[PDB]
Design a protein around this ligand. Structure first.
Ligand SMILES: *C/C=C(C)/C=C/C=C(C)/C=C/C1=C(C)CCCC1(C)C
Length: 137
């Protein structure tokens, strides 16, 4: 599997519902949904080490990790967390997150490379799953 690429979003489902679970108010939810229709994920993969840059029009952030090694990032709604990525299969990884301070919904994400050349990213907060689909530029 080679996740490396400049990925462009083509589909985003249930993102507003995810943000609702996370306590984002309705107006900012709609604005965030609009930002998601634009956004890109750049991946550089070397073996089990991943460099990921997620960007929208006005914001960019970097996720760096090695599979199986704890690291710190933020949840979708922006709360700092400790994260651990594991493979679920040849082409799919899963990340469990634990809040660094306080409580909140159980969050996680997955990244999958399909046989058709798509990247599928899911983000979960409790029972609500957002699914996002990208293609390479
Ligand atoms: C492997 C790829 C990962 C973990 C990508 C994660 C992307 C996000 C958490 C992006 C979240 C966004 C917002 C919270 C609001 C603006 C739009 C997004 C989709 C960039």
């Amino acid at each position: 599997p080679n996740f490396s690429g400049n990925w462009k979003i083509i589909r985003s489902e249930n993102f507003e519902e995810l943000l609702k679970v996370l306590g984002v108010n309705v107006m900012l939810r709609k604005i965030a949904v609009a930002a998601a229709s634009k956004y890109a994920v750049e991946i550089k993969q070397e073996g089990d080490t991943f460099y990921i840059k997620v960007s929208t029009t006005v914001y960019t952030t970097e996720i760096n990790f090695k599979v199986g090694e704890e690291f710190e990032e933020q949840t979708v709604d922006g709360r700092p967390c400790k994260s651990l990525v594991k493979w679920e299969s040849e082409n799919k990884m899963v990340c469990e997150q634990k809040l660094l301070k306080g409580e909140g919904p159980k969050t996680s994400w997955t990244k999958e490379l399909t046989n058709d050349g798509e990247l599928i990213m899911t983000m979960t907060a409790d029972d609500v799953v957002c699914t996002q689909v990208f293609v390479r530029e």
